[PDB]
Symmetry: D3
Subunit: 306 residues, 6 copies
């Protein structure tokens, strides 16, 4: 089969970059809405006997884009494609992954089921909120890591990285922080609400590393505790920058040295209203995974380099 | 089990009307959206061992209401309810029911499959675009009719109904038109585009009967053809009035005697900007079907009276 | 994989014609019945890793041919074939496609489910009664059209086709009629029972176009209404000619100029007892669809020519 | 729920007797055929919230009866019944239960899958050809035994039963023969083709016991071998008497003392043309099984008495 | 229906205690092994129309107990029970819940799938390793907490609990520790390998709280780090005490004040060879969940008291 | 794709022999157990886009080996292999294939279902206890025969085979012996318990042929009956030699001329403690089936030669 790369309405810029690294052109698909706000999908080329890849990120209008993804997957399945792969840099409803309330839903499993009945055979995603979402599917699921690119940014941009500290803004983020600290051979701390800090922090550069920042109610309160606790400068490094609601107003009025995110969510608009925001490119990692999945090579090689 | 009636964000007024006819109160559910525009559903009462009935219409913002419905169904299924029934007065994506294009989707079947994997056991809907959507499910599906209420309106409001004529604005609507005409003993006509009229029409009160009006393009060119053909006055009777886009601007600048719709879609806002719009209450037919499904009575009795 | 063409008991002549156009030979299968009237299927060649195509029409004795088809599909699936495609020129139980009665079945969906659990991956059919039966399956379904061959016959055989009129014998057949009329730039009419005619007809050659004729209770009554309404000669063009029951006795005692059908159902025996019956060959359209599905070409090209 | 007993076109008499033993009336269902030989099913009462039982035997026109059964099960399932039980005294396609040929089907598993996807929840059958057809299903399957009635008939009718012999006409029927012989405390023999006899037989009454007799090509050659081997009189006892093909011509021209069968298949017509045929009533056992399944009693009690 | 309580080979003592709180007798089931070490299950009562509950913990020989559970669930499903619930205090293969290696299995999802196809409808478990295993099922899953009983033990036994500290032996156990600290209004610490401690712990009683201890390689190294860091006495509180391999030899040769575990795994043999081990009874929490699930009461009430 | 041969813990010697006939090396997989006796599976090569074959026999610790098989199948399915085939020379739980008791399980169907949800696409086995287990799967199942190798052994080793007799130790084994007798043109006998013998036996060499011997409470008592009935010497030929429990002590204390088995179960340890045991190599038949399934050749050719 031949790679047929398709792009949804969300994050059109990343799909163009992945096409460039793969050395191909995006497929002909027109995705608009009808008068009554119903998704319209018009694929403009034959997907018969092809390896269709669709890039759709859980950003912007989550529900509008999610239905767009399911209609595109189902259209390519009935149009007699060979395999259909959903490339989702940010997984929607990933924070609703367990039932710790009375009648709470598990919306991550509902989205997993809906992608399965549309007809997707493979899933490629980056830095899932819970790694266990891989078990919500009966199909192969790729969970790429942005950590090798995060480590590269720290070494080149922060000069004092050899004698810095790494801070976790939440109790559940200690797994991510401890892995990064060992790779840099530095110390680490942890911040818990209900604000308590456990770690030296004083008179050293502190880096806040999390997986996502929706409204930045965290990290911004964490930065105040870090500056009150003796740290000189504070850095914030994140993978998925949603920056919804106040968010930008909190970052613009905070004392972060820099806020660093990836390409998983469109950052072009947010970067106009915040000079602290910096972006790490991940289109190289996504293009390599699509390349190796198509050719039947080892994706495990990606978890050994940048 | 006990009836537990829930209402989604869409069409809150009909759910209250159905609750009054059933003589109960709506269940405690809070449906908001998070900062990143993700649906939040919080059921505030035990649904364990209950007959849950969720009323959600495919109107307004379709994709956000549809994802609202699936989260509510899945939450009630995992919360150990006895049965879950989706009451959907207007079915979303009902116009995409076949594949007559190159790589077209069938989004009616995708929506059908999503309701199945959420965990719905029964579907109650009214006046489907295609009756064959009943076969898109492997569960019982109820297809109610607004025709008995349509015929009741004609007999009381139009005085010349004994010598009127029903006009079909399209070629695919001849099934509805001929059934109505035979039930009234009056003649019928038909209008086809690419605009042609077959039927007397001249010096007679013409009634345009269709199942739906989205942008009212068809019921506007048809009305102009009817007034140019000799009909004194033109009436339009519809079941699902979406009235999206121009729609209202076309109805206000038209020569309809009246435009008549049902409760399936909220008409309170549209009736302010158009005096030609009239509403037929259908909350009694929905309440009776919910009542009879719970009590194990014959729903076929509904198709013999009003 | 290699095409392996198999033929069921029904319509052996079309399978031979399709084999000739494809330039191959029919596979070795022996289908008889045991003493207790149970279907016996004996495939006499290896189907391992092959693209199996089974041609079975819903004609003759429906239930014995339908069980024949399911046994053949299941035998080829367990025999490790690559893909199995059911080519069904006339779909059985296509008229039971909805539930508009008290405890009516939907037998079109039951037959759809049986073909799925036998192991079919693709369905190729022509001129379904309802196009929505495509959504009764979760697999690709091809719905071919006999209209390009219908229009070709009219142009060469009826000399007055430039000033003729197409008549719909029922209210639900107005979709086929209006599409044909626009493609010929001529007018159209419509006949409804409970018998009333709308259209000129008078002093014009009327053509009755329908999708199928089982007992010819319709068209035969329509022709009488057309001859009493001023039409000179009446033609009838149909896709699936079952001609069961009286049928032939009604056609022989009618005033049709000609009755025209296709190859979907065996017409060799019926043509002996009726001289008005003419046949349109469709073995080229079926062979092209089989050829293009195997080669991964565009079947949409078939809906642009003859 | 309430028992709703339905009867298919096959074996109306057994259904009437089962209704009599249960003290109820058969449900209102009309099952005829259309002009093109398609099954028509018209249930004439509400099955909503009921325990529907359908009695259909695999006899006569096997395929038409099987389609009838599937259509009835699906109609009762979609019509919102509580449970649907298929009571099948003789299972169709039970002899095709394994793949011992090149591309042979396993039609028993296909029938099992079709019954599963129609919507049946329970299966009640008597004396399956292979007991593993119980494992062909994912639902409960009852396999009743006619052996107690066979033993009762042997005791009351044959006077010399205390010093008789029991003969198996095939190598695969040695299990039934050994079980019956042990229950009667008599000896046993076996007959194999490719005819060889292993047993005394000489100067004693020999009883041929099998599970079914389709064409009676066996048992007749077995009877000739037994009469040539020194046995005085030969009896034949069977469970399912199909008697298709020559069958009756072979029994009338044979030297059986009596041929004894059960009610699983209609026997009145065959009993008209053969004086040797005798029938054992099994309606009591089926009625008891239905009664105990409805009331949630122990069906295992039936395998301890008559 | 009626509660039918069944017990597997593993942890026979807890099943007896749960039966006593529910005020009933355990069901009659004999579970032995054949000569070739295959599980034999012999239920000695009618489960027809009953609410069957089976108590089986993932301890001892995991694979023999897991196959025992599936055979009991499947036997009770085919025996026409009403509902089947698996009560699993310790879930097997809970630590293999994600794919973070080259070709790693996710054996938690395989066990989830094998419980689904056996026929279980509900799962009751306590303190899952990952809460997300709830989403590995499409059925309701109860995740009980042993924390309220853990808090009761600390207050009753440790006198210095008002000025103690809670220590996490791993980076991933920070979620449990921070929640317990807030409930007691005390401080907390964290220990990470690759052994580094963050927190005071000097001159105060330190409590190590985890979810399970398999070989006690952790907690034993953590205790050495705590005692050399200035802590006075060290306590270890765990939920699932496996104590496999050396385990006991490490606890007997350590400086724990006490090792406290729950009833999820049999502890009677371990406490003979270790005086430091203490058991917390949870048979009241399991009995209440079983009682409330059967009666259709709120299980959420259990997460507000002891 | 490429053949990737994997071996489980059970029967490492047969896998090596099959690898040699196929001319390849076994795949890199390490299978051990954790401290708490849970299966660990670590594949050391890329199975991506490969035809994976796993050889695992139902011997030794059945439950440990069965869970090992499912973990290996599921790991290779999620690792994006092309096809996964389970080669099982001896099928676990094959004797529990029907429900002839009150609440008996059918554990052969449970094992079939667990192999289906792990992700296996093909099953290769030898001499199933019941041939109908092929219908317990919805996937192709190969049922190889050891009979051609059994016939070869008799002709080469037993000199009196031309005037010998074949004895079946059970009523259910008459199918095997009658087929073997016809291929040798010799006589046959049968032994039934509740011990009675039918057949000459006297003054001739008797061969006892069965499918398996677990504990030899079967042939051993049959051999005693044969020697007291006049047979000169007794041979025992079996396919699956389990030899569990007493087994060997009964064979060592019996009067068998020889006990002959196959490679389906490891025999190396048994032949140390029994000189009567002889082994027939079947690694050539398994290698040919694996070779032909991969290459898409006819497996039916194997049932015409050795
Ligand atoms: N899009 C969203 N925006 C804000 N909150 C969300 C969103 N989706 C889910 N949530 C809520 O946020 C909570 C996330 O909790 P989390 O910090 O992940 O707990 P833990 O750290 O124990 O996993 C969930 O309980 C969920 O109810
Ligand atoms: N550190 C890691 N090394 C290798 N794989 C990892 C790692 N972390 C997570 N994974 C997961 O393991 C999977 C390995 O991909 P897979 O296709 O099995 O590799 P291969 O091509 O060698 O079979 C990836 O999809 C990834 O999600
Ligand atoms: N004119 C009609 N009369 C009766 N039923 C109809 C009609 N039109 C459609 N139906 C369908 O028939 C179904 C009858 O409901 P059902 O529960 O089967 O009736 P009962 O309660 O008698 O079993 C309805 O769900 C409806 O969708
Ligand atoms: N007028 C039409 N033009 C194109 N396709 C049509 C038309 N009418 C119906 N169809 C449906 O569209 C499908 C197109 O086949 P498909 O394999 O999707 O095309 P492609 O090979 O270009 O992907 C056909 O199976 C047919 O059923
Ligand atoms: N001799 C036998 N005794 C009991 N059951 C048998 C026997 N032979 C076969 N069976 C099977 O065992 C099943 C027992 O039915 P079941 O509903 O499990 O009994 P209970 O009502 O006691 O649970 C029957 O359906 C029958 O098919
Ligand atoms: N703190 C908590 N409060 C309530 N429920 C919780 C909590 N933590 C987890 N849960 C989960 O919520 C579920 C509530 O059970 P459910 O049957 O929904 O209760 P109800 O009967 O009120 O609907 C439990 O199964 C449990 O797994
Ligand atoms: N005597 C026999 N001859 C041929 N096939 C047999 C015989 N006995 C059993 N079989 C079954 O028939 C199957 C034939 O395999 P299959 O893949 O259909 O062959 P082919 O490649 O010729 O289609 C085997 O899997 C086997 O289980
Ligand atoms: Mg979380
Ligand atoms: Mg339409
Ligand atoms: Mg129709
Ligand atoms: Mg047989
Ligand atoms: Mg873990
Ligand atoms: Mg057996």
């Amino acid at each position: 089969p031949n790679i047929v790369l398709f792009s949804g309405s969300s994050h059109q810029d990343l799909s163009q970059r992945v096409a460039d690294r793969l050395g191909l052109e995006l497929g002909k698909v027109v995705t608009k809405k009808f008068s009554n706000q119903e998704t319209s999908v018009e694929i403009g080329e034959s997907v018969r006997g092809e390896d269709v890849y669709i890039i759709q990120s859980g950003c912007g209008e989550i529900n509008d884009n999610l239905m767009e993804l399911l209609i595109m997957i189902n259209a390519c399945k009935i149009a007699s494609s060979s395999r259909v792969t959903a490339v989702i840099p940010c997984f929607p409803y990933a924070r609703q992954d367990k039932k710790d309330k009375s009648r709470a839903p598990i919306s991550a499993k509902l989205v997993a089921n809906m992608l399965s009945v549309a007809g997707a055979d493979h899933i490629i995603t980056m830095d899932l909120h819970a790694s266990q979402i891989q078990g919500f599917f009966d199909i192969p699921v790729d969970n790429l890591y942005a950590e090798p690119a995060v480590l590269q940014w720290i070494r080149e941009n922060i000069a004092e990285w050899k004698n810095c500290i790494i801070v976790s803004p939440d109790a559940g983020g200690a797994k991510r922080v401890t892995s990064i600290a060992d790779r840099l051979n530095v110390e680490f701390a942890l911040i818990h609400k209900e604000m308590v800090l456990v770690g030296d922090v004083k008179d050293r550069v502190a880096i806040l590393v999390d997986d996502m920042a929706d409204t930045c109610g965290t990290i911004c309160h964490a930065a105040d505790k870090l500056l009150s606790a003796g740290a000189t400068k504070v850095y914030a490094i994140l993978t998925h920058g949603i920056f919804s609601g106040p968010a930008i107003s909190r970052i613009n009025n905070a004392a972060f040295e820099a806020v660093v995110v990836t390409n998983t969510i469109p950052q072009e608009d947010k970067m106009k209203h915040c000079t602290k925001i910096q972006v790490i490119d991940i289109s190289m990692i996504l293009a390599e995974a699509i390349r190796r999945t198509h050719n039947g090579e080892s994706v495990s090689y990606l978890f050994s380099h940048v």
